[PDB]
């Protein structure tokens, strides 16, 4: 294999892991390694008393299991008055053997913090630093005064700049604005599968649908310098692709996430990550597999007791069951959704098809030359009633 200079990272919420041990970190890291992810962005806050402890555990774990990590300073909490502490943290970790390196320099990033100047940090740390903050305006990325080396976009979902929820499908419009402004500097593109949040302070969806697959196809077209997956473990916004960890701290998101595994989305990601790193325009399918996802009820069901209203944007969703097939040769896909039954011929490669949702049991089957290659029952029966509004999805898979 030829050496590559493209890398995939994943956003990790340090704020929810006060009780993590080194072993807990290692478990997440092994699953990320198996997906082909190169590093976790350790998103952390100045206000958490356990930040230094958990950064130390994560860097130790990464060095022990041949993984890499870098810091995402979360400027919802860190502030422009924190140069001294940010500098001291980078002095500790920029040359750590577990620190992710890009072109010989320690990668550092942010959530927000567009106005934070990296100059004083870089000039105080002997080891080179490569600063790729999260920037909100593509125009600023092209004119920033903060000594940046690239920009990371958080525009992972369909949006038009405003505060209305817009329909999909997702496009590359924002990616292409960042790339135009960045010129020779690097772009770290966001990849997210889904979005649903349901708190007193934030209650909306974005219109994602086929996004768990479609976004990876956009990455092969676009070939950004870096990718960050949003997210490994942000349960509260439903975009996690990592496991539901036993050791994280619940914020109320257990209501819509505890029984909703998302691990099978890593089956889609794995071959696309390999193709992205190799510069290939299509993935290589190693074996026959299927990944499916769907919401728990039809979108129009009224709840019996939710103290929060329905999320903003749900009228734009479809009542669909989504199926990504990963096929070595062409085959036939059959889906039963309640009383509904559908069939479609599917090409070799990785293809997503959506099917009308019916209340009841869900069934999946792929047949080739008249014989069933893979199949089984969906792990969740769709219902026609709910106690609370849950616009997260259940995800599952079958593998030959």
Author numbering: 32 to 431
What did the published study say regarding this structure?
Glycoside hydrolase family 71 (GH71) includes α-1,3-glucan degrading enzymes which could be exploited for biotechnological applications; however, the family is presently poorly understood. To increase our understanding of GH71, we have performed a phylogenetic analysis of the family and detailed biochemical analysis of two of the five GH71 enzymes encoded by Aspergillus nidulans (AnGH71B and -C). We present the first structure of a GH71 protein, AnGH71C, including structures with carbohydrate ligands. These structures revealed a conserved acidic dyad (DxxE), found to be crucial for activity, and active site water coordination consistent with a classical inverting GH mechanism.
As no protein structural information is hitherto present for GH71 and to establish a greater fundamental understanding of the family, we pursued the structural determination of AnGH71C by macromolecular crystallography. The structure was solved to 1.33 Å resolution by molecular replacement using a model of the protein generated by AlphaFold232,33 and all residues of the protein could be modelled into the electron density map, except for 9 and 12 N-terminal residues in chains A and B, respectively, and the N-terminal His6 purification tag. Crystals of the apo protein and glucose-soaked crystals were of the C121 space group with similar unit cell dimensions and contained 2 molecules in the asymmetric unit, while the nigerotetraose soak was determined in P1 containing 4 molecules in the asymmetric unit. The protein contains an N-terminal (β/α)8 barrel, a short linker (9 residues), and a C-terminal β-sandwich comprised of 8 strands which packs along the side of the barrel. The β-sandwich domain has an immunoglobulin-like fold with a topology most closely related to Fibronectin type III (FnIII) members but contains an additional C-terminal β-strand (βE) compared to canonical members. The βE strand interacts with βA forming a four stranded sheet packing into a 4 × 4 sandwich which, to the best of our knowledge, is the first observation of such a topology. The interface in AnGH71C buries 21% of the sandwiches’ solvent accessible surface, as determined by analysis with PISA40, which includes several hydrophobic and aromatic residues along both faces and is stabilized by 14 hydrogen bonds and a salt bridge. The N-terminal (β/α)8-barrel domain is most closely related to GH99 (Cα RMSD between 2.8 and 3.1 to GH99 members), a family mainly containing retaining endo-α-1,2-mannanases as characterized members. The most distinct difference between the GH99 and GH71 (β/α)8-barrels is that AnGH71C lacks a region of ~50 residues found between β1 and α1 in the GH99 members, which forms a large loop wrapping one side of the substrate binding cleft.
